[PDB]
Amino acid sequence: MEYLIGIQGPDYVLVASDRVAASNIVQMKDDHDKMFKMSEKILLLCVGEAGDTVQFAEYIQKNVQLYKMRNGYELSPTAAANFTRRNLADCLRSRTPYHVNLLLAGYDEHEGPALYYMDYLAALAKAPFAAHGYGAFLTLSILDRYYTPTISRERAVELLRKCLEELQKRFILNLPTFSVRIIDKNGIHDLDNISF
Amino acid sequence: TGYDLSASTFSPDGRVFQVEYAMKAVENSSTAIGIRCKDGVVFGVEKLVLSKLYEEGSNKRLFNVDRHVGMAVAGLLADARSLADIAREEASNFRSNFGYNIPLKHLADRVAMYVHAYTLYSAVRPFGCSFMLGSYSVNDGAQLYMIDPSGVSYGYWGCAIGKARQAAKTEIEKLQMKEMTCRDIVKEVAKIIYIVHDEVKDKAFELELSWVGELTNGRHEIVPKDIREEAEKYAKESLK
Amino acid sequence: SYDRAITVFSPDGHLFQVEYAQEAVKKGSTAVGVRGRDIVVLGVEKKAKLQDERTVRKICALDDNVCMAFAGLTADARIVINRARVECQSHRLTVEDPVTVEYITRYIASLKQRYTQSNGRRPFGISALIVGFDFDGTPRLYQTDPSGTYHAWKANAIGRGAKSVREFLEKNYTDEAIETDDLTIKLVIKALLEVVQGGKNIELAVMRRDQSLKILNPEEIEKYV
Amino acid sequence: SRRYDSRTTIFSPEGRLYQVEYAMEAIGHAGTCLGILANDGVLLAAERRNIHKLLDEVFFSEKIYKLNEDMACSVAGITSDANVLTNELRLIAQRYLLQYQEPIPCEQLVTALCDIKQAYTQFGGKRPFGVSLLYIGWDKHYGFQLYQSDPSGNYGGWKATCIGNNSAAAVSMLKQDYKEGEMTLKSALALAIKVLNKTMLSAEKVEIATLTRENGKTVIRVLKQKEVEQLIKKHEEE
Amino acid sequence: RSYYS
Amino acid sequence: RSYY
Amino acid sequence: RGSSAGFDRHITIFSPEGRLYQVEYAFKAINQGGLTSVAVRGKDCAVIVTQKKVPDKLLDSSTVTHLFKITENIGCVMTGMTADSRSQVQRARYEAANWKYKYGYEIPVDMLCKRIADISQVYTQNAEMRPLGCCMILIGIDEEQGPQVYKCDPAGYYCGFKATAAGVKQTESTSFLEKKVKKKFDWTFEQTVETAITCLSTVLSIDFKPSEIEVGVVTVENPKFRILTEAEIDAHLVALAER
Amino acid sequence: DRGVNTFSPEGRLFQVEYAIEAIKLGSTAIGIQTSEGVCLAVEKRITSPLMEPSSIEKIVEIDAHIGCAMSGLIADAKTLIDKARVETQNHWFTYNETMTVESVTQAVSNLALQFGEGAMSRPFGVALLFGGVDEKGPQLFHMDPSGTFVQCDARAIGSASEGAQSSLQEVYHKSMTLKEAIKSSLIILKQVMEEKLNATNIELATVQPGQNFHMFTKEELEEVI
Amino acid sequence: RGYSFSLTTFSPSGKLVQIEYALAAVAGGAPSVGIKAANGVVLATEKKQKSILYDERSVHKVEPITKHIGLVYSGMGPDYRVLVHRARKLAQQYYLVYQEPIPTAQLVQRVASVMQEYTQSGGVRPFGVSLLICGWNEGRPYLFQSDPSGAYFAWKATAMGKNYVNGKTFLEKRYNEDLELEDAIHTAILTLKESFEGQMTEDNIEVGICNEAGFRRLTPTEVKDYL
Amino acid sequence: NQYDNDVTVWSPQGRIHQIEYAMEAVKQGSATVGLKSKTHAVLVALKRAAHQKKILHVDNHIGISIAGLTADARLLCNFMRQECLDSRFVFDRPLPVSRLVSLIGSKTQIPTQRYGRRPYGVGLLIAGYDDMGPHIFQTCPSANYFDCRAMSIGARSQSARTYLERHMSEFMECNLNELVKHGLRALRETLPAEQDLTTKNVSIGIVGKDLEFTIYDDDDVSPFLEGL
Ligand SMILES: *[C@@H]1CC(=O)N(CC)C1=O
Ligand SMILES: *[C@@H]1CC(=O)N(CC)C1=O
Ligand SMILES: [Cl-]
Ligand SMILES: [Cl-]
Ligand SMILES: [Cl-]
Ligand SMILES: [Cl-]
Ligand SMILES: [Cl-]
Ligand SMILES: [Cl-]
Ligand SMILES: [Cl-]
Ligand SMILES: [Cl-]
Ligand SMILES: [Cl-]
Ligand SMILES: [Cl-]
Ligand SMILES: [Cl-]
Ligand SMILES: [Cl-]
Ligand SMILES: [Cl-]
Ligand SMILES: [Cl-]
Ligand SMILES: [K+]
Ligand SMILES: [Mg+2]
């Protein structure tokens, strides 16, 4: 499976995802990117069924970009999360359901940082931290143990590193590298990959 | 300005001129007659020869619409052919649904209601044709119906359509058709066509004859060539 | 639905509805476009007090790398602009590249052409000037009109008094005039001052290589005048 | 049938849309309706064209419609057409809220309806809607706002405007009296009475609605007859 | 007219 | 008219 | 005052006076037939009488009729354009059959008449078709109300009557029938078949042979619609003579 | 008042008549068929020095072996050109072979007369010259708004086609080389053109049994002049 | 097929002439009167009893829509029947959803919306009818008018049809708000009597009332008593 | 005037002007001739740049010659081809020629009765061979059709018809060569006195007892012209 993680701090959201694309018994790509830029201050992280993931995420991407072009300003993270949920819930009982699990991370100028969790059934929850994949089973308790709402960006990265090290130790799948990004008032920043 | 451009328009005196204009197209056609006799129905058509290049039998004005039903037409022939198809389809559908041969009266009514539907709308124009339907069976006897462009349908002992209709009726009224056989009637039909034929104005014509009766076992058929020629000779010598 | 043939040929091979659409363009405010060396500039004439300036603008971004100005029916323009905006996103989706200025022009033109040959519809009553840069950083300026014809220009004008402005640009569009960014903007203002008799009633926008659309302030326009 | 078709969606030889222009003629004969933006709110002031003695007055308003939590509008033209359009505005607002789970920004609501009006001028062979609308509202993007739309599907933002009867005379008075950026609701009220005084005075003959913000929430209220009768008395002194 | 520009 |  | 504008005489749009000319012209179309029909109801029965003109000897007179069975218990007489008439008869038969199928009881005469009238209304409002140039009179027994006579017209109007008429001599027939009810006690017809024949004979000034009229009846004792034979009609004409 | 599918008393479709008249508003195009190949030449008709000459495209590639010159309402032609391009590719897909010049012309002409009462409201106001090479050798076809198409040894279309056709009938012979044909059409274009013929205001393309559709470059045009 | 273009369009002076011509059909119709009392509403109309041959009980001008809503009209009778059917249908569609009788105002709005459609939709003319709708909900009486354009008004009392102008000023003189239902019926009949002449009976007028117990037509016996 | 713009409008004289106008379209086409013997049916056509095609293959047993709107001709030819394919697919036998012509008449009648539609502005000569021997049919914009011993349509075809009537008594007994020459002679009557049949302007189509419908053009028509 694919791994997603998000950690919301006071004025930032930190996100990470594995960089493996698997097929059967082989890793086919080791520099895969599971993050999609929606706007200047919004990232959508998407995992699940092949085809469905990129089709759905890119559809939301182009629609969020269209909104900006039409209106001269961007969707807020909360508006984007609800838009995403509407589309996924609308398709749930249609001929074209999308089997995708998502995190949406964003910074609003007025509302501050936000992290949203959505499953393939299209239930939406705002969370201070969240994770998708089998890896989440091994990492959510580490977050519960060490997370505080006032956690600094420096500490968030080390807390992320704790989660990733746990996967190396305890998880049966080979996930050696991770994309790391942070969103704040200054937009989306690419951090160094965490590698093993 | 004009009240005569659409079938969906009444004139101030309550007329539908488009239907009347379509009837004029029938009145300009050459004459067809039907006569109901003791044991069947006979049809005859004055079929004008417009060119010597055409085959003997071209532009038939007599149709089989079912095995037991004949149709004789006057007016715009393309419209008549399409009505023959409507009638055929109606007879065909009746058998499929109800499992027996369509009664003539019912077929007349059904086709007439189709004709009528073309007298209501700007979207379509009325048929420029009148036609006769003829049939025979033991149960129903001989039946002859006539439908006009308005969609009116009546049964007749004798009937004529086309330009010499009034002159044809005068001759038909002289017959006691009820007492006569189809064999006698074909000769009389040939005669009446030769009488009403305007020899000076229209030059050349073929006589077209069909019948349905006890003698054809309720099947609509062309009158045999030999009987047709005998009728032509009788009609020619009668005109002496 | 309504299926009447609205655009038809007349004797002499005229399409009257298209010609009438072109008359609607001439009733529109003047719009000027100049392609520079490494800049493209659009300028438009403005018609009032008590009005919100932000809401009624004749310069609009289609994508990050493409924007357009229009003359004619403003309602028709909004429809064409939003159609083009959707198409820019469909292209990014399918080809994973931003649209070329020529591609989106071709799209807008063919949309306009379809409304000259479709039942139940009248043509769009606008012309458009479309500007931007390609992948290789080449500046571009295209014009579309109601018939669906499009062409590339060094400089052009559309709307009321387009013919006079065009004749000015023909005599003024030289290497010296487009040598710098300041002189490129100036040439547009001069072109507009030729028919606007004004200087405080003009809206102007600049687009530079991969730098997105920048609309100039009234204070910055007052410096040039 | 090509004979009976009046061809409502074609160009004239000058590039004009006749049905649109004739629709705007209709609006010029409708009850006076004006809106004024201030620092602490927006207002709508309408002339009641229902001033008969035997009328019942069963609604809270006759010409002012609530569109959503943060928006109201007023209309000039064919009443029945206005009913169609205002219903549609409510639907668009709710469709947006469903999708985004936030209120529709004011300009987005205006644009959406104007697209419908534009469509009627370009295809379908129908008569356009004979309605001009004034929209008042607040959103988190631009705060207090006032918009006007006309039958062609053109719209614009205004600090003050007027539609309907004697609107040209009203827009003149507004240019003279409207202090840009210095208007309160109380002074805007005063100016509204003053403008309606000339272009038309009784409390039964006018209708005033205000839109304000209280405790991070929009308040839309139609002034009671007592408040309007007190505002009419306050002017006549001037 | 106000419906051009 | 009454329909305005 | 008889003013016109645009296409108000060609299609069913309003004239300046608020008239529908195409509808008015449809009433004129009814008279193009040159026939008159009379209907009268009593306590015991309802009767329809119409002219039967067979000018052509070559016609099979048995196929010339303006009396139609709609159901077993509902008869009607049609006045006006013949093909339009037959079309409206088929529609009535359809509406009546469909009613029985859906609701499990026979359509009331008032309801069938209302339905036909509602259909005709559509032709007065939609521009693309013309109204039918015909008039329908329906008779039947109602369980509660007794014998019924109903009439609908090309305008989509309909009504129940003590007695009515249609066609060329409609106004003259109405005059005759009005003068007769005002004499009878409780404003009700007693000898209903005799009244209908007498009315039609007076307004036309004919004095009929049994082959010159058609008669249809429904009675409280015999609700089934019945068409009188030539011999049955004669016994009425002979009785109306020998008084 | 009158419908798009009305016959005149002379038995002609009015709309088709009027569409043929619109061809006369177009610039002159010439095609010559030789045993060595086919050449197409078209007058660009520049209306302003500010307009980019290379953005005027009146000769287009249909496939590697087929070119197309157009005259009339150019916006109308784009949809016809697309149909031709798609159809050649459809034929390749299905049959794994090149579609003949005749077959392509036939497919495009099937669109014509397919108008009436959001389908096509009117005929296309363009004439086309199809020039290419197949197994029958080099071939030139003409198609007009009526949907009639025919093989031509040499053909001119546009405003000055009557005069140009006279010139063609004088100079053309069956054994004529391609280099001669190129020179012939350039001489004829020169005399029928309003403006002075140079390397920027005309287009020229050839298709040969040897090589693919080739659009003449600026330098190649200068050599020929 | 059916025409897709409007048969009502704007004239150069900004008028919709078909609607005005529709109002001419209304004004030429038989007179109707509506009076809202303190504890009820009354609807009254003239029956053009052009003959004694008519069965006056066979068709009605005063018609129930629901148990609590009734209507009458001036103008074209057949057009009225269409709107009666639609109104009944709209009232049921509301009831199925909300399981509550439709408020009078909601019924009027939906019906007026249908009337608007026929001023804009393809190939149709407007309705040549104005409606008077009465109802009782929220322990309160209602009287509405709906015109051919789809515009609706709430009235304390009004008249439509022939001589409606004279009828309105007659009502303006003889109406106070405190007047109860018994008295309102009396004054409604008198309003029709202003433009009748022809000896008023209980066969040539129709009266409907609306109160807490709902809407019903007055029986011929009840009408005979008020006369 | 007001009676001649719509195919759905009858004139007071009981005519439809649009149909008559459509028939003028075929008169403006170049002449074509069809004739038959007891074994063969032959089409001969004058072609008005290459000379425009006039003879079209429909099936192995049916070919057509056209006069009038070229586009209507191909639309009708495609319909005819399809009907023939359908028949062979379903029944594994050629569609009888008379049945195809009936299908044509039924198809071309539909637009003559519907508003906004127009008649087919094309006339056809149809040459075929089936169980009932050789056939020549003629179809009209009116949607009427005729079974012919011989026929000619197009411009100045009246003089071709005159030739055909004069000689038709010997057509039935002609061999193929004599029958083609008869067709060529008839077509030559349509030409101005100076102009002659050449290999550039003549097109021949032949179908018969033991010959599939074949079209002869250019060099292929030389043997037929040599005998004249
Ligand atoms: C039927 C019942 C009634 O009185 N009317 C008005 C004249 C009818 O039409
Ligand atoms: C019969 C039908 C047709 O096309 N023509 C030639 C004008 C006829 O004579
Ligand atoms: Cl006749
Ligand atoms: Cl489109
Ligand atoms: Cl311009
Ligand atoms: Cl809300
Ligand atoms: Cl909201
Ligand atoms: Cl009695
Ligand atoms: Cl040309
Ligand atoms: Cl339409
Ligand atoms: Cl009902
Ligand atoms: Cl209820
Ligand atoms: Cl009741
Ligand atoms: Cl053609
Ligand atoms: Cl013919
Ligand atoms: Cl001919
Ligand atoms: K109608
Ligand atoms: Mg799937």
Short mmCIF file of C-alpha atoms and ligand atoms in Angstrom, two decimals, chain G residues 189-191 195, ligand 8:
data_model
loop_
_atom_site.label_atom_id
_atom_site.label_comp_id
_atom_site.label_asym_id
_atom_site.label_seq_id
_atom_site.Cartn_x
_atom_site.Cartn_y
_atom_site.Cartn_z
CA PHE G 189 -89.81 17.48 -21.18
CA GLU G 190 -92.27 14.57 -21.07
CA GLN G 191 -92.64 13.25 -24.64
CA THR G 195 -90.27 16.88 -29.04
CL CL K 8 -92.70 17.32 -23.54
#
